[PDB]
Design a binder for this molecule. Sequence first.
Ligand SMILES: *CC(=O)N1[C@@H](c2ccc(C(=O)OC)cc2)c2[nH]c3ccccc3c2C[C@@H]1C(=O)OC
Length: 163
Amino acid sequence: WRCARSMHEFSAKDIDGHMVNLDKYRGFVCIVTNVASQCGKTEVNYTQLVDLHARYAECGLRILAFPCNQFGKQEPGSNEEIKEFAAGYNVKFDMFSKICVNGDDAHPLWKWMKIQPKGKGILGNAIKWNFTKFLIDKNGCVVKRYGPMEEPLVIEKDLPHYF
Ligand SMILES: *CC(=O)N1[C@@H](c2ccc(C(=O)OC)cc2)c2[nH]c3ccccc3c2C[C@@H]1C(=O)OC
């Protein structure tokens, strides 16, 4: 994974258990984010992500949400329960099966994103908490990273430069 050159070289199981080849996102600007149902910022992140997708899907914005239980055990539920939880926020973007984002068992896409030049956060490579966001350009390269404290709407400053 270390020498992969694009998010499009990876695959991941979606929240229904179906393996997805991420080269389907070639030509689309993507937000990749680790999510959780029981986080103090769950509501702000889900609602603003849904708002961004509603406003920009016509522009080519796609959103990939990876549930993760590594931060305060705040995603303890099953994939089926998390799918129903996201439905409650009217999520129409792409939900994936629960993964790890840190450590040796982290999904290889996340290992790769964290070492990209724009994938290093202001506080370093490790994912620090729920709802870190990566902006991915149409070629599958990481172009921005946003921390758990940065609400999704801050990403609006960067989107028009990559569509
Ligand atoms: C995808 C897209 O259409 N973009 C531009 C845009 C045109 C018209 C509408 C609209 O009718 O609203 C419902 C919405 C978006 C666009 N314009 C624009 C101006 C300032 C900042 C961003 C911005 C966009 C996003 C998108 C685009 O072409 O960005 C390069």
